[PDB]
Ligand binder design. Structure first.
Ligand SMILES: CN1C(=O)c2ccccc2NC(=O)/C1=C/c1ccccc1
Ligand SMILES: CN1C(=O)c2ccccc2NC(=O)/C1=C/c1ccccc1
Ligand SMILES: [Br-]
Ligand SMILES: [Br-]
Ligand SMILES: [Cl-]
Ligand SMILES: [Cl-]
Ligand code: NI
Ligand code: NI
Lengths: 287, 287
């Protein structure tokens, strides 16, 4: 049986319950083709200049991604489409509040464009967050997901060009002795479609077999505000931050956060007041 | 049997193993009387002006602390003694690296001065982190502590003036039906002594019974860099940050962090580079 497909607009209330059950769901038209085109245009040059993941020039090398992979994070200052349209997506926020209501506020752990060159090999079958958040390995087996990953297609995903593999139900597996490429199904997607998985869903990038096709995706890891993001927005110029909505500012860590505890005392506060009140942080100030 | 007492200097290697076993240990002369006096002097006026914890002026009210309690956090910009001496304490860093090596880097979740007025009632017996980090309630029972709390005496702790109660062994309790003030022992301390507990140690502030004594403490919650701090240093002026050591800057969240994962990809990074490299962040620049 295949990955369930849901309409971003008509099936909005079914998306999280479907992922909680099956560990994966494909959201059709998660982003419009306009947003996809504007995103591709704004990030294009940054993909071209990006060194290899484990470049000796970096003090935080990624030794896991293949040398024919380019990853570009901290998209807020590069892309107006990302910081305005993607960060304020009504679909993303309904799914995240459905998923994370038991914990409280959520933010972006990483928003990155990944481009995978022709003849890129299949990734090993894995769960996300194991190279950054060892704490998630100590959660009780039946603990609600603390992070989820929107894999948004910025180019076509096909069986031939290395569409994502997932194992349905694998987010509930404790015994991993049935893990095999034989147990997987493929996330076939048009640009703007998104594959939504949890931090427990076993998956991998597929093998590029055409030898000519370049595959590109926008990976948005959304997590509870209690977990530290993989990326920092500390160096994002303040005029850019002040052009965002209050909601977008919170997702980038430029606001105080709240837990779901009945008498929550909050996160990233300043003597009982918020970051935004303290710094007198402006919102929606056009550049 | 009483809370074990250890010398900051001669018993340094025994401090964490003692806490891991008993759930509490008193560190004699954790801070020198010089540092204690300079800290008290620099924070004095900020204690006097601080409103009630649940003041209607605050957008993050603390509804749990008694109205005869004052709490002041974000100490870096107030106190030179805190930002230079306390943040670079060789004792604190040996204990934290002993406690958190399985997880990776650690930082300050909150450094606060608490002052409790005459006739302040005893707090209810509790574990810390339940009003900010509901995620810790979902960790496996035998998961290593993700945060620890140094309760540093800034004034004398006596049975009469409301010295902390702890239940020894309570950090390993799953059944909480033996929780009673009858099961507790007291943390009797001179200024500069510290009571070290885990996030699982059941404890409470004692009742002030003299009706004249004001009790003051410096509470430093140290946690794995994977957990979000209760306080923010985002608004701390950059000249102050650039006067700190590289280690102190990391503890305040003004640097990238690393997990203990063999091929760690890191936390708060910028396209494979650190905050400090990216922003060209200076260190130990005197004001
Ligand atoms: C290493 N690695 C990443 O870099 C990565 C990239 C984008 C988004 C999340 C992310 N986190 C990971 O856990 C990850 C998994 C992974 C595992 C196996 C093979 C290749 C990747
Ligand atoms: C509410 N509360 C705090 O404010 C607090 C204060 C200082 C340091 C940590 C801290 N975190 C807590 O979990 C906390 C516990 C607590 C429980 C019961 C009674 C009074 C306090
Ligand atoms: Br993929
Ligand atoms: Br106390
Ligand atoms: Cl890869
Ligand atoms: Cl109190
Ligand atoms: Ni993955
Ligand atoms: Ni406490």
């Amino acid at each position: 049986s295949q990955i369930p497909r849901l309409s971003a607009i008509n099936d909005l209330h079914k998306i999280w319950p479907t992922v909680e059950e099956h560990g994966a769901a494909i959201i059709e038209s998660f982003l419009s083709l306009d947003i996809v085109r504007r995103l591709n245009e704004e990030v294009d040059p940054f993909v071209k200049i990006e060194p290899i993941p484990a470049a000796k020039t970096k003090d935080h090398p990624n030794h896991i991604l293949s040398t024919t992979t380019r990853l570009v994070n901290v998209l807020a200052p590069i892309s107006k489409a990302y910081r305005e349209d993607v960060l304020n997506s009504k679909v993303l926020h309904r799914i995240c509040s459905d998923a994370f209501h038991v914990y409280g506020d959520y933010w972006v752990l990483m928003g990155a464009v990944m481009e995978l060159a022709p003849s890129n090999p299949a990734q090993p079958l894995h769960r996300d967050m194991r190279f950054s958040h060892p704490i998630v390995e100590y959660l009780k087996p039946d603990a609600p997901a603390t992070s989820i990953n929107f894999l948004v297609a910025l180019s076509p995903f096909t069986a031939e060009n290395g569409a994502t593999h997932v194992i349905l139900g694998s987010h509930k597996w404790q015994n991993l002795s049935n893990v095999s490429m034989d147990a997987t199904v493929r996330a076939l997607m048009n640009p703007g479609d998104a594959l939504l998985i949890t931090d427990s869903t076993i998956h991998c990038g597929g093998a590029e077999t055409t030898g000519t096709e370049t595959r590109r995706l926008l990976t948005i890891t959304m997590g509870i505000s209690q977990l530290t993001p993989l990326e920092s927005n500390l160096a994002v110029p303040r005029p850019v931050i002040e052009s965002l909505t209050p909601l977008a500012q919170r997702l980038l860590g430029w606001a105080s956060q709240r837990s779901a505890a009945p008498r929550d005392i909050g996160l990233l506060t300043i003597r009982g007041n918020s970051i935004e009140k303290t710094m007198n942080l402006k919102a929606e100030q056009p550049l």
